[PDB]
Each structure stands twice: as structure tokens, then as C-alpha cells.
Amino acid sequence: AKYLELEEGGVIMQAFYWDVPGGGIWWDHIRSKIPEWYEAGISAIWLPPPSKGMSGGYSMGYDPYDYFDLGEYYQKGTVETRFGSKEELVRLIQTAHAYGIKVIADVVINHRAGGDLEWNPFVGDYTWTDFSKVASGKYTANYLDFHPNELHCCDEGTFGGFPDICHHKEWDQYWLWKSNESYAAYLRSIGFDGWRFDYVKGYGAWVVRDWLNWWGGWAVGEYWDTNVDALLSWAYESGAKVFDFPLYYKMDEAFDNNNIPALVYALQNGQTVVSRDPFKAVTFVANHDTDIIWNKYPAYAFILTYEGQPVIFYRDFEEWLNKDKLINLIWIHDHLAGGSTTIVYYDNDELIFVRNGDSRRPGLITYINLSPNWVGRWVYVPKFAGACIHEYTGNLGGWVDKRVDSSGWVYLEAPPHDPANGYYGYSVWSYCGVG
Numbered sequence: 001a002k003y004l005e006l007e008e009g010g011v012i013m014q015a016f017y018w019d020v021p022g023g024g025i026w027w028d029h030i031r032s033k034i035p036e037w038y039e040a041g042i043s044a045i046w047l048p049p050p051s052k053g054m055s056g057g058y059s060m061g062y063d064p065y066d067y068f069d070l071g072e073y074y075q076k077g078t079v080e081t082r083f084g085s086k087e088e089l090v091r092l093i094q095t096a097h098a099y100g101i102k103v104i105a106d107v108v109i110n111h112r113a114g115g116d117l118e119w120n121p122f123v124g125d126y127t128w129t130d131f132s133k134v135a136s137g138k139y140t141a142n143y144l145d146f147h148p149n150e151l152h153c154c155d156e157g158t159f160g161g162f163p164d165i166c167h168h169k170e171w172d173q174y175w176l177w178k179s180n181e182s183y184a185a186y187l188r189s190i191g192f193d194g195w196r197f198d199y200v201k202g203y204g205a206w207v208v209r210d211w212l213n214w215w216g217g218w219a220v221g222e223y224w225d226t227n228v229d230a231l232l233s234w235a236y237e238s239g240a241k242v243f244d245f246p247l248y249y250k251m252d253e254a255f256d257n258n259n260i261p262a263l264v265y266a267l268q269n270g271q272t273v274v275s276r277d278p279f280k281a282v283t284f285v286a287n288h289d290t291d292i293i294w295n296k297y298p299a300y301a302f303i304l305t306y307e308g309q310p311v312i313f314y315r316d317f318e319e320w321l322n323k324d325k326l327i328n329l330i331w332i333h334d335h336l337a338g339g340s341t342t343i344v345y346y347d348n349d350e351l352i353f354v355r356n357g358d359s360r361r362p363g364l365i366t367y368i369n370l371s372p373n374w375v376g377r378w379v380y381v382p383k384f385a386g387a388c389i390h391e392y393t394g395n396l397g398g399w400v401d402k403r404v405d406s407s408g409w410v411y412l413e414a415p416p417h418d419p420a421n422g423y424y425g426y427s428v429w430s431y432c433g434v435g
């Protein structure tokens with residue numbers, strides 16, 4: 001990648017959103033963006049589930065039917081998936097790799113959908129568990145491969161009424177990751193580097209752990225919950241990272257309601273994954289399932305200058321927000337955002353913190369303002385004592401430099417938070433001359 005690599009905590013782009021334009025144009029559409037995203041500093045792209053789903057052309061991939069059909073067989077009323085054909089996906093991955101950008105596969109293995117009606121001896125009724133007709137002829141299945149069966153009735157969880165996969169069966173283990181004919185093998189064979197595990201609360205952490213033991217690669221599990229202990233327990237057991245839903249909700253509490261203290265408190269008392277283990281936290285401002293944060297500018301300013309590994313939501317970058325502001329924060333994240341964090345000021349609508357720097361990144365000062373007016377504060381930042389600091393976003397309307405006296409005191413300023421009028425509510429500072 002241009003700046004930091006995925007394995008180095010680089011920024012990730014969720015290259016989709018709920019119900020992207022159909023017609024099989026998504027893979028090509030994303031492929032055309034690779035050169036721009038490379039220049040923007042994106043280190044990896046997370047793609048939606050690539051397999052043929054029950055709802056065919058309308059499927060978002062979360063109702064997988066034939067895992068081994070990436071848009072190559074006429075099935076469920078279509079050859080290509082909603083996103084495109086197999087080759088288009090392969091070409092996308094090849095283009096990403098040509099630019100050193102990694103690709104993350106969205107693995108949906110808790111459930112399956114689109115099976116034929118079949119008598120189920122354990123349910124005592126008919127179930128849509130007959131998957132013997134999948135066009136790929138790979139990973140066929142019947143009621144024995146789902147809950148309930150002769151092993152047990154249920155596992156950690158189900159999703160709606162979709163046939164719930166029993167990973168304890170060797171047949172299913174073989175087809176999903178335990179062989180060179182597995183779904184993991186197939187995804188890896190076409191270029192996928194990492195994994196994003198869907199609804200991990202629906203099955204055991206051991207599944208992800210064994211998958212990773214066999215294939216390695218960067219990984220994150222989607223464990224939708226606010227209980228940090230539960231998320232970190234799953235993370236340490238599975239060996240994968242977890243999306244920081246706890247931080248997501250706390251950022252919303254603070255940034256969308258002039259309640260910064262709510263976020264400070266959460267960060268101080270372990271109510272976020274990132275404040276407990278920044279090496280396990282995958283941070284985000286929004287995703288395809290939930291998007292409650294309205295004031296996204298200070299939110300992105302925060303996850304891109306604070307600790308953890310940030311993800312940028314496709315729609316914010318390509319449709320709703322000022323792309324240049326995001327490109328700027330990615331540059332800042334990879335060049336300045338390093339080291340431990342020290343909060344130096346806060347009130348209901350303002351948050352100022354310092355990143356103390358690491359071996360490659362000098363550190364920075366983030367000044368978030370949720371108020372509708374220009375603000376300025378005298379702050380004690382000994383980290384930058386006796387230095388020339390520069391504002392790196394340009395949100396002050398121009399090129400601005402300041403001298404932090406030998407003591408550590410400096411008068412910092414932040415623009416109004418009125419994005420509707422081009423005032424984004426944040427300024428970011430660091431040593432002059434970095435980039």
C-alpha cells in the first residue's frame with residue numbers, strides 16, 4: 001500500500017453498503033476506484049459476501065446458497081451475483097494487489113439459504129435444508145448439516161429462520177475451511193488476504209480459531225454487542241479482532257449530543273474495546289447495518305487520529321462526505337497518529353487530545369469542536385514544547401503555523417462545527433515540516 005499496510009494497522013475501506021446498485025456492476029465499479037483509493041492511502045478493501053445467494057440478483061450475500069458460485073453459474077435466476085461475475089471479482093483483487101492493497105472476504109457461515117423442501121427427522125416437519133442441487137456441485141448438504149440434528153439441537157445462535165449450520169460436523173468443517181477444497185481455500189485461491197466473519201455470536205470462537213490456524217491472514221469478527229468483556233473474550237479466544245461497537249455507540253453519545261464527557265468517561269473506564277486493547281479494536285463511524293452518527297466529521301477525525309484500526313464506510317467516502325477531508329485524515333492517520341494518548345482538555349462540546357508518537361509517527365494534537373462557533377483554548381501540551389506546530393487539515397481556512405513555548409503552552413484553535421456550511425468542527429496539529 002502507499003502508506004501503512006493492513007497488518008500494520010492501515011486504514012480499511014468497507015467497499016459497499018446496503019443494497020448497492022444491482023445488475024452485476026459492483027465489482028467493476030469498485031475496481032475502477034482502486035487507483036484513487038491507492039493514492040488516498042487505503043491499505044485494504046472489505047468486500048461484501050461474494051457467493052450466490054437465495055435471492056439471486058437481489059441478494060447482498062448474507063443469505064448464501066452455493067458458496068462455490070461467485071457469479072459463474074445460472075442459479076436463482078441469474079449467472080452473476082448482485083455484485084458481478086467471478087472473473088470481475090478476480091480482476092478486482094488482481095488490481096488491488098497490483099497496488100499492494102489487501103482484500104478482505106466477508107465470510108457468512110452461521111447460516112445458509114435457498115435450500116429445497118425436505119423431511120426433517122429431528123424437527124418432525126419439512127425444512128428447506130436440501131442443498132443437493134447447488135450448481136457448483138461443491139458443499140452439498142441436507143438436514144444433517146444444520147440444527148437440529150443427531151449431535152444437538154442448537155448452537156450459540158440463529159439468524160431469523162435461516163438453516164443454521166452445525167460446524168461440529170466434519171463434512172461442514174471439510175467444506176468450509178478444513179481442506180484444499182474448502183470455501184476458505186477457494187477464496188484464498190482467487191486472492192483474498194483477510195477475513196471479516198459475519199455474526200460470530202451465532203457459533204463458537206473455536207471455529208474462527210481453527211480457520212485462522214489453517215489459513216492465517218488478518219481477521220475481524222462481527223460481534224455486535226456493547227459488553228466489552230464479551231467482545232474481548234471472543235477476540236482472545238478466536239485470535240481475531242472485533243469491530244468496536246462499544247466505541248461506535250459512545251462516539252454517537254458524545255458527538256451527536258454535545259456530550260463529550262460521555263466519551264471521555266467510556267475511554268477512562270474501559271467501556272470501549274480500543275481503550276482496553278487497541279490491537280484488537282477495529283473502529284468505524286458507520287457500516288451497512290447501522291448508521292446513527294449524524295456528525296460524521298468529528299467522528300472520522302476521532303477514529304483516524306485516535307488508537308485502533310479505522311474503517312471508512314464506502315458511502316461516506318464516495319457519496320455523502322467531502323472526500324478530500326477523508327483523504328486528508330487518512331494521510332494524517334498514517335503519518336502522525338501514533339503512540340499513547342493523553343486527553344488535555346474537554347467540556348460538553350470540545351475535546352483536545354495528544355498522540356505522543358511512536359517510532360515512525362511523530363504524534364499530533366486533535367481539537368474537536370461540536371459548537372457552532374470558532375473556539376480557542378490555551379492548552380498544556382509539553383509533548384510539543386519548544387516546537388513549530390502546523391495545522392494539517394486546512395480547516396482553519398489556510399496555512400497556519402504556531403510556536404509552542406518551551407513550557408508546553410500554546411493557544412490552539414478549532415473551526416465551528418457547521419458542516420452544512422463547510423465548517424467541519426476540528427483541527428489537527430503536529431510538528432511543522434512532516435508532510
Ligand SMILES: OC[C@H]1O[C@H](O)[C@H](O)[C@@H](O)[C@@H]1O
Nearest residue numbers: 286291292293294296316320
Ligand atoms: O450528509 C449525510 C448522510 O449522513 C449519514 O451518513 C446518514 O445516514 C445519511 O442518511 C445522510 O444522507
Ligand SMILES: [Ca+2]
Nearest residue numbers: 155157164202
Ligand atoms: Ca448458529
Ligand SMILES: [Zn+2]
Nearest residue numbers: 024084085088
Ligand atoms: Zn458482468
Ligand SMILES: [Zn+2]
Nearest residue numbers: 155166167168
Ligand atoms: Zn452444531
Ligand SMILES: [Zn+2]
Nearest residue numbers: 256292293294
Ligand atoms: Zn447519532
Ligand SMILES: [Zn+2]
Nearest residue numbers: 033036317318
Ligand atoms: Zn472516489
Ligand SMILES: [Zn+2]
Nearest residue numbers: 347348349350
Ligand atoms: Zn466548549
